[model samples]
Target: KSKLPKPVQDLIKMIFDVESMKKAMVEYEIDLQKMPLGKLSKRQIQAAYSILSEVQQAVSQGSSDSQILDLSNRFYTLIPHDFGMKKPPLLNNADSVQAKAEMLDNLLDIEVAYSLLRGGSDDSSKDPIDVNYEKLKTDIKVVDRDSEEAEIIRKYVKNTHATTHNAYDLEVIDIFKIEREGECQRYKPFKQLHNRRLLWHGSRTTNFAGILSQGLRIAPPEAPVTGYMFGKGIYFADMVSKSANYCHTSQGDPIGLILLGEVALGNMYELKHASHISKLPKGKHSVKGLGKTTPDPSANISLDGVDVPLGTGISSGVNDTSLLYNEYIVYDIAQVNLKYLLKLKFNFKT
Candidate 1:
């Protein structure tokens, strides 16, 4: 007796027809061909492996599609998520006849790709099978001032909408947290359907520059500036020293700032000065309203890259004693560069 309604079981069976999938799988052939080689593939079956392939194999051997999908879900936890590259969701999901069939296609695609990788690495003439993640270099003899890096690099991303959207375009995006994604440097599969990374979380406040005198305040540009992160060879925006002096608002609160640069895997990159490094209130960091209680930015920056392990904080702030980490930009460092040296300086000339 089938556990699912007879139509689903039949639909899954009808949909997973190997002949149809085999004909449709040519496009994914390149996808399979692109997986990494030798190391992860040779090291362990757990990391770069999958059970859906077996389900796929069984799928071809007359096993029922629903049965295959169920076992695949049970075994989904057995292997790491996405098997390395942007992995998809677990099998206990909405597997339409189409999506599940694509799973089968991907299941077959992995083996096809794996076979090529192991065999092709030895060949001399063809381009190596790999992903080119490094940003390509551009032509020289010219520099664009309009470049965002020149204007500024602000990780203070806001607003869920694209350039045209406004308050009326609110939409919800949901996703599953991938437990196995250790620094894969990519978003979950759902960001494409919706993105709210730069959603606005601000309040009635004076901008940082307005809080202090021109001679006293020195960080980022006081002029009109743009922001960007994730370097594309060159970036815009200003650089500050290792630390900047912060003056509170009329009510007394640390003003916030951001450091912008392409972070590699190491803490030591560059731009540690009054102008390069912008200081912000640490997340969940609480001190008396007066005096610099937080130690003089004793921080390091090794092995930090893209969205650098910035200090995390509570979601909001109070009017007097403490500020929320997320709502107010000032917060403590989350993971200090465990193994790096940060150069410090002042922008003022005596």
Candidate 2:
């Protein structure tokens, strides 16, 4: 029998889960008949992105209503989104355009996994689970509960938690160090940038394979500027709850995954309100959404010389601001080095 811990085995199953992946595709209304998982091609996704960019430009210039409708139809024809025989919505607004962009993002990853699945499984001798696990291209090791790293992560989850609306107490079930192949090489260039801090990025369980394979990416250039609060970038948060909400977990499926990324936030451009910025101002490397409360500065700790802002909640000294907890965004993909992945159980107080 394999000596792997029970929790680790569970995580492996979750990440490589084909059923959940298919469910996500179905929920997105991807036409399995028209574009089966194995049939999804990178070239097709690229074409879809190109169409989105054109649609974005047309919407920005306030092009004729008829033109937007035509572009939307063209997009549907290429990607084949299922609308259940109903009319597909026109890509006339920023929100609509961004939604499709996000769909394409998920589709890109799904394509990667599906292709890998097909490429593998040729060997009749290998188990399906083994084949799927091999496609991750990363090393996942469970952290020892008594280790200093685990304690720091546990403290982070506890101290940065809140009981606000729709919030639940998060119990740390396990933590895994996700050493994605070539991730270090890609992140090495940005390592020396100042203000490197371990931040949280929560995503759906189905997206982990692509995320681990491709790393966190900014919104595609074809996406509308208005879709992002601070332009197209990879978003993060200091408070666990803030990021956890992005996980979009349910009471039925209480378990979720969150990433602790070492983000190189070189110079921050602080904002108090929503600004649809297509580009950052001169000398600013990132954007920070100021909040009413944040982790206490004094309680901040370090792991392997990287800042861990796990301090308890404290007044941010700002009387008026849009957010309750800080939001960090980085434009460059290289700035983020995925450090740890935590499996959390959301205890909803009914």
Candidate 3:
């Protein structure tokens, strides 16, 4: 008359053990539930809250520790055997062991939910839990000759590599070609003049002198240069100004020039005309055709001459009738050395 197999009987015994554990847990839950929810002390509330948190975390973490296994075994043991069967002990839908196990799981979930609600504002402190997101923007600082600012500029220039030159050595001419006939019209000539002056003056007189002059010049043409043109000489000034604006807006800082080798020549002009800003020298310069060594005076600072090889045109010029310009030519040149001038802010908490 008994339909249950030997294994089924063994399972039934295990279910009984689970039932015992569930009963104990239920007693604890009921005792805690009877307390006035609002009047509970922080410590008491925390204990109840911790129980639910631990359960959820343990389940989510997929912990297979023996303790968790024991807990699961206890749960299984609490399952009822049958619904209304009288002939023999066996599983049935009405009051079967499976139904009892499901009910126990629901009960635990309810207990966890109730505790979460009960642990309210008072349980957690409200000190604003401050969180800060710091953004650093690159800035420009122009220094006058013999001024303290110049020293800062010198240090920065010394540390950061020039764009036209290779990493270690200086190049007389390493041009960065650009094609913008429309844009280069504005300050291109002035820029050309500025570059010439830099070459004539050398690093010593060029230190922030021309850049500082832009501040004192007349209106529009005379107003100390805010920016220059480059693309199509006509549009070059606006192009550079827009580029600087974009660099500032997107990066949350000022746009700067990183010169290496021949690029340093442009920086000399930029430092002289744009304004004396702090410099950031990186790695030593390397010679172009002759390998890594000091640059020869005769070579141009164009990209074609320095780091970029003459025949191996990485950024070669392109002629287009619609734009009337060359692609790989240096339309404009300016210096940007950010390492020394700008102050960087940091968040310790993150």
Question: What overall lDDT goes with each candidate model?
Answer: 0.24, 0.82, 0.25
Off by over 4 Å in 1: 1-66, 69-78, 81-92, 95-143, 146-350
**Model 2 agreement with the true structure over 1-350: per-residue lDDT tens digits:** 33556776687678767777677777888777786777778888888888888888898899988888889888989887677866887888778888888778777777776666567557757655555566777777899999988999999989898666545679898999888888898888888778899999998887787787678887666544655777888999998978998777778788889999999888899998888774788988889999898999999988566799999888898949988889899988888999899999988887
Q: List the RMSD of every prediction in angstroms.
A: 25.5, 2.6, 32.0
Q: Which digits, one per residue and each the tens of the lDDT, describe model 3 over residues 1-350?
A: 22333332232232223333344345434232343223334343333333333434454566567544544344333322222334233222223333333333334333332333333353233221110000001122222446543443333233322233321222111111112222234434434331221111111111111112121111122111122211111111101111121111112211122211122223221111122122222321111111121222232233222222111112213222222211111222332111111111111121
Against the true structure, what is each candidate's TM-score? 0.16, 0.88, 0.14
- Find the candidate with the highest lDDT and give its number: 2
Q: Residue 283 in candidate 2 has what lDDT?
A: 82
Worst 10 residues of 2 by lDDT: 219-228
Using TM-score, give the best candidate's number.
2
After TM-score superposition, the amount by which residue 311's alpha carbon in candidate 2 deviates from its true location, in angstroms, is: 1.9
Better of 1 and 2 by lDDT: 2
